[PDB]
Design a protein around this ligand. Structure first.
Ligand SMILES: *[C@@H]1O[C@H](CO)[C@@H](O[C@@H]2O[C@H](CO)[C@@H](O)[C@H](O)[C@H]2NC(C)=O)[C@H](O)[C@H]1NC(C)=O
Ligand SMILES: *[C@@H]1O[C@H](CO)[C@@H](O[C@@H]2O[C@H](CO)[C@@H](O)[C@H](O)[C@H]2NC(C)=O)[C@H](O)[C@H]1NC(C)=O
Ligand SMILES: *[C@@H]1O[C@H](CO)[C@@H](O[C@@H]2O[C@H](CO)[C@@H](O)[C@H](O)[C@H]2NC(C)=O)[C@H](O)[C@H]1NC(C)=O
Ligand SMILES: *[C@@H]1O[C@H](CO)[C@@H](O[C@@H]2O[C@H](CO)[C@@H](O)[C@H](O)[C@H]2NC(C)=O)[C@H](O)[C@H]1NC(C)=O
Ligand SMILES: *[C@@H]1O[C@H](CO)[C@@H](O[C@@H]2O[C@H](CO)[C@@H](O)[C@H](O)[C@H]2NC(C)=O)[C@H](O)[C@H]1NC(C)=O
Ligand SMILES: *[C@@H]1O[C@H](CO)[C@@H](O)[C@H](O)[C@H]1NC(C)=O
Ligand SMILES: *[C@@H]1O[C@H](CO)[C@@H](O)[C@H](O)[C@H]1NC(C)=O
Ligand SMILES: *[C@@H]1O[C@H](CO)[C@@H](O)[C@H](O)[C@H]1NC(C)=O
Ligand SMILES: *[C@@H]1O[C@H](CO)[C@@H](O)[C@H](O)[C@H]1NC(C)=O
Ligand SMILES: *[C@@H]1O[C@H](CO)[C@@H](O)[C@H](O)[C@H]1NC(C)=O
Ligand SMILES: *[C@@H]1O[C@H](CO)[C@@H](O)[C@H](O)[C@H]1NC(C)=O
Lengths: 68, 403, 184
């Protein structure tokens, strides 16, 4: 809740996290934090909510697939 | 003749999370509270545990209601859907928040010792969930949640749904442009109704107003005297004797613990009601979006084809597409027909006739056909049924095998 | 634990606190302790009541799933397990149940070509329960899953009007049964 001008330091929406370094990568959420922020240990890092992977199937006028 | 109409069904999902600690709520920075509150045991620790559990289960419920797929599906770059125009449903990249105009209008229409915890999943992730689910149900048919995704064209999956509801699919092809135009007109009409009528979204506004009224009543109820000498917490700490201040503040914190307890019970009952409503919404999600339902009066008023999942603030909004028949006409029916002393029963429908000419038809649509042998079966004779009529039955190939 | 709480009194004991205090103040102290313990019991029974309501709702859902997923088969999607549902194996558990759902998970799909209808002999052809699936110059039909090619005949298809309004329609040659046995 509180802002972090007063009291390594990364600004988020649910406050700020002290003692961890933010990364721009995408991983699976392990510790739920809030506002899409997730933390995992591998020291400790913080990252946004990565929703698995993106896989859009092709669509056309005439295309059908049946499992075998 | 049949028409296509769309309705709305709004169910709450999640309220606003609250966090309360006992000591700062009952008083501000007093050691007397520290040495007196522990004499009541761990009463306020139980309340903190209950609120943390409610927040955890609310986050889990919010994760469970929407994230029901293992992958995120992006929309194809071609908007051709067999003559069907879906413009205000799919999100438009001309908005920084990546929202369709319908939920934009819905969000525009829908309006110290406390902490307001933000939700675990933000509105951007909810919009991404709804966009991915809409893409998965528009390009992968009604069979994609059982495992790896597939792809089926939109008229073919509509024909599959029409086969599954109990009518022939050919009536989809004879009025495909009419069906698309009626769907576009219904979407525009429901968009105008949502943008105009302000009473259609009463449930979310009611639950948010209930939570805000509970918080405001708690805030106004905290600053009461409760029969004590002083109302301000630190005024009695400097006006009354510290040996003599073991009664008034004790009664004050006892009454405040009573108020916090009844607020916790009210919040728990409201959370149970919201949990039941969200379980019902998750049942609707599993039954009407992932596949087509066959039970009646569950999604829309009439026979249900498929539904549109969309994002709503502190809830979910539904677009249920139904099947409303029209143009009623009187006709004569018969239990069976008898030919050459043998009774013939319809294969899947019923006999229909206007005058002296009998025809067969499907379940809930009028398509007259010549009574043949391949679409009927013979069981017994025409002497046990009541009120049978007489008509001839043509025989397939019978004049074709004479050569 | 709340039994040993002082609740603002001198001591949490009962027999010892009677001897050390005179009755005009011992009555007030005992009344305060009894009211505090009754409030704690009220909190406990309220928590037990809401927990019992939640467990009753969960048990009603479990009884419904007993009545539906175990007894017979239901055709609904991902209610009894994940994906399509074949059977359910309920097993015993202390104060709970554990579920074993035999599920149908199709996989290893292959790309194919289709058609909305067949325009043969001036009339439109529609499948009964299958769909026209093709890979090249040949044409076949199959079910929803476990792709199996079959020759398009007149018994698995029907006719409804002519072939002029269906968009994307393609010409095809259909084999008719009883054609080789015509003069004999
Ligand atoms: C079934 O109802 C639809 C809806 O009214 C009819 O479509 C209308 O048809 C008239 C004349 O054919 C047109 O002037 C309208 O513009 C159509 N409406 C729309 C929204 O396009 C349809 O004709 C009816 N079919 C039958 C067989 O009665
Ligand atoms: C699908 O419907 C929408 C809305 O009816 C169409 O959007 C309109 O497009 C015209 C042409 O530029 C504009 O003048 C209107 O203002 C638009 N209406 C809106 C944005 O509400 C859209 O063109 C249709 N698409 C297709 C393929 O028919
Ligand atoms: C009931 O509807 C049927 C279907 O149109 C009518 O049958 C037609 O009758 C005329 C005159 O005998 C024939 O030329 C047509 O070939 C018939 N059509 C079919 C599809 O069989 C029938 O006449 C109608 N009955 C009444 C009393 O109007
Ligand atoms: C339908 O056909 C049956 C068989 O041809 C009719 O039954 C006979 O009808 C004649 C006169 O209509 C009677 O003399 C016979 O005694 C009847 N036989 C039996 C076994 O019932 C029947 O009447 C016809 N029904 C209609 C409505 O025409
Ligand atoms: C489409 O699939 C069919 C079915 O397997 C293929 O037909 C086979 O072709 C091979 C190659 O000569 C023959 O040995 C088989 O006997 C054929 N089977 C049947 C049932 O006809 C066909 O070749 C495939 N077409 C393409 C373009 O791949
Ligand atoms: C915190 O303070 C910084 C600078 O003082 C400001 O840019 C930021 O918006 C503030 N955040 C909040 C949540 O108040
Ligand atoms: C990485 O994330 C930071 C936010 O901390 C952002 O300012 C920066 O632009 C990002 N860089 C890239 C390459 O995305
Ligand atoms: C589908 O066909 C139309 C013309 O009938 C064409 O404009 C469109 O590009 C086609 N879509 C494809 C090939 O994906
Ligand atoms: C069917 O018959 C009833 C009874 O006379 C009548 O009230 C009704 O209007 C008729 N409907 C049509 C479509 O003719
Ligand atoms: C079918 O073709 C599309 C388009 O190239 C491709 O993305 C997809 O992987 C193909 N499916 C299979 C099973 O190879
Ligand atoms: C083949 O199809 C085209 C268009 O689909 C049509 O114009 C033509 O008449 C068809 N020819 C035959 C022999 O069916």
């Amino acid at each position: 809740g509180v802002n972090c001008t007063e009291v390594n330091v990364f600004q988020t929406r649910a406050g700020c996290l002290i003692g961890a370094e933010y990364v721009n990568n995408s991983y699976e959420c392990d510790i739920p934090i809030g506002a899409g922020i997730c933390a995992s240990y591998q020291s400790i890092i913080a990252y946004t909510m990565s929703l698995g992977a993106e896989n859009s199937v092709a669509y056309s006028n005439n295309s059908i697939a049946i499992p075998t | 003749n049949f028409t296509i109409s769309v309705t709305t069904e709004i169910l709450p999902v999640s309220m606003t999370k609250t966090s309360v600690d006992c000591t700062m709520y009952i008083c501000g920075d007093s050691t007397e509270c520290s040495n007196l509150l522990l004499q009541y045991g761990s009463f306020c620790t139980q309340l903190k545990r209950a609120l943390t559990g409610i927040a955890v289960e609310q986050d889990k419920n919010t994760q469970e209601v929407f994230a029901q797929v293992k992958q995120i599906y992006k929309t194809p770059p071609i908007k051709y859907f067999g003559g069907f125009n879906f413009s205000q449903i799919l999100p438009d990249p001309s908005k920084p928040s990546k929202r369709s105009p319908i939920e934009d209008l819905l969000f525009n229409k829908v309006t110290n010792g406390l902490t307001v915890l933000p939700p675990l999943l933000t509105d951007e992730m909810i919009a991404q969930y709804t966009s991915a689910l809409l893409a998965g149900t528009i390009t992968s048919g009604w069979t994609f949640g059982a495992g790896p995704a597939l792809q089926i064209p939109f008229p073919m999956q509509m024909a599959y749904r029409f086969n599954g509801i109990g009518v022939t699919q050919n009536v989809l092809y004879e009025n495909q442009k009419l069906i698309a135009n009626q769907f576009n007109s219904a979407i525009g009409k429901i968009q105008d109704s949502l943008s105009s009528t302000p009473s259609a979204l009463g449930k979310l506004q009611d639950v948010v107003n209930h939570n805000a009224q509970a918080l405001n009543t708690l805030v106004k109820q905290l600053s009461s005297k409760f029969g004590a000498i002083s109302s301000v917490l630190n005024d009695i700490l400097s006006r009354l004797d510290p040996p003599e201040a073991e009664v008034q503040i004790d009664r004050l914190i006892t009454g405040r613990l009573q108020s916090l307890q009844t607020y916790v019970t009210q919040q728990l009952i409201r959370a149970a009601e919201i949990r039941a409503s969200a379980n019902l919404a998750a049942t609707k999600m599993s039954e009407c979006v992932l596949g087509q339902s066959k039970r009646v009066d569950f999604c829309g008023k009439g026979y249900h084809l498929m539904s549109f999942p969309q994002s709503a603030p502190h809830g979910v909004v539904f677009l249920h597409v139904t099947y409303v028949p029209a143009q009623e006409k009187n006709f004569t029916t018969a239990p069976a027909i008898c030919h050459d002393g043998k009774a013939h029963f319809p294969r899947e429908g019923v006999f229909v006739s206007n005058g002296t000419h009998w025809f067969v038809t499907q379940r809930n649509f009028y398509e007259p056909q010549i009574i043949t042998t391949d679409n009927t079966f013979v069981s017994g004779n025409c002497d046990v049924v009541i009120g049978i009529v007489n008509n001839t039955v043509y025989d397939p190939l019978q004049p074709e095998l004479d050569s």
